[PDB]
Write a protein that binds this ligand. Structure first.
Ligand SMILES: *SCCNC(=O)c1cc2cc(F)ccc2[nH]1
Ligand SMILES: *SCCNC(=O)c1cc2cc(F)ccc2[nH]1
Lengths: 200, 198
């Protein structure tokens, strides 16, 4: 078929990492408005049919252990997997509370060879990294650099109105448009091999 | 307004850089089959409706001037623009005949403002090598008859280039080369849906 099979017991997991406060040492300030993002997103993704977990002010070691343990779960009865990262960022790196880890190490755990239960299933990453290569099939990255957040608000609004009738590329194209109309722009890196509808 | 407005005199320009033979001083081999690639691409994109021109074994400066002059042209009557790159590739950089040149420098000429006539219109880059940012750019990037990527892109486009949206085409391309076994990507900064008709 031309779209991902969605006939599973569940839609799948949605991990939200909400980093607001950072250790003085990192020279990063409070990320005001992120709670509003985190909350809109969890409500939104809950409503699509995801099982949402929300983590807050995580260390670098937590974000790593967190995701690794998620990648070691049994995803057989799930349609897909989503992870949302709201934090500080610089080229190819995301901030924990105590430092900096490469976005690539975070996503690497969900790789065909190390996460057999999610093979041929979409793995979704929405990164909202304010202050500034995992090349494998069925990955998708929605990265935004624009400083709740415009990107996050737009994602949520389009998703709650069209989440069940549009394909992700359509959703995220529309998102790109309105963070663009508010006037930087978000992007989308797709390695997807089918079309993705969150419905049945 | 959910789709890019295609109502113009022409679809637009489509430059093809087809680098096969490389200057000794780079120790880069003959890219056999890149000619079957470039011919496949020419016929396909011409059939979509692009004004296609093919340039062979371009040097680094040729590639730069090609694209700068290209951006300097008047694009008032065109729906969009498309560049296809067939070469050797490393990290964020293409090869000319006479060495290497960074991808971004090629697209820099087409930015939001340096090419005011292409503003609000899709600039498509199809790269087959073996940042940067901005509204209405799209990259289809691959690593490896001709290459599996090209062969897939041409077949799907020959068949659905007139009824499917750009992202649907490229997703099918992705799936197709994946079936053969690396995987092509799509970087999208598009703000609308893209159809090659109406
Ligand atoms: S929002 C994605 C950020 N930029 C990239 O990751 C990127 C740009 C680009 C351009 C190319 F020609 C090929 C690959 C590529 N990745
Ligand atoms: S074909 C593109 C290869 N990888 C990238 O260019 C890439 C991956 C990635 C992941 C992100 F979270 C953000 C941007 C990004 N570009």
């Amino acid at each position: 078929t031309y779209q991902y099979n969605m006939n599973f017991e569940k839609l799948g997991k949605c991990i939200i990492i909400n980093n607001k406060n950072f250790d003085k040492v990192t020279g990063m300030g409070v990320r005001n408005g992120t709670d509003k993002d985190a909350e809109a997103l969890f409500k939104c993704f809950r409503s699509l049919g995801f099982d949402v977990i929300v983590y807050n002010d995580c260390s670098c070691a937590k974000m790593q252990d967190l995701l690794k343990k998620a990648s070691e779960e049994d995803h057989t009865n799930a349609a897909c997997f989503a992870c949302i990262l709201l934090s500080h960022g610089e080229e190819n790196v995301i901030y924990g509370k105590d430092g900096v880890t490469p976005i690539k190490d975070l996503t690497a755990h969900f790789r065909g060879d190390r996460c057999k239960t999610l093979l041929e299933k979409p793995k979704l990453f929405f990164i909202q990294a304010c202050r500034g290569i995992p090349v494998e099939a069925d990955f998708l990255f929605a990265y935004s650099t624009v400083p709740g957040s415009w990107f996050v608000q737009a994602l949520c609004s389009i998703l709650e109105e069209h989440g069940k009738d549009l394909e992700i590329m359509q959703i995220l194209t529309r998102v790109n448009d309105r963070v663009a109309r508010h006037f930087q722009i978000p992007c989308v890196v797709s390695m997807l091999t089918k079309e993705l509808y969150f419905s049945q």
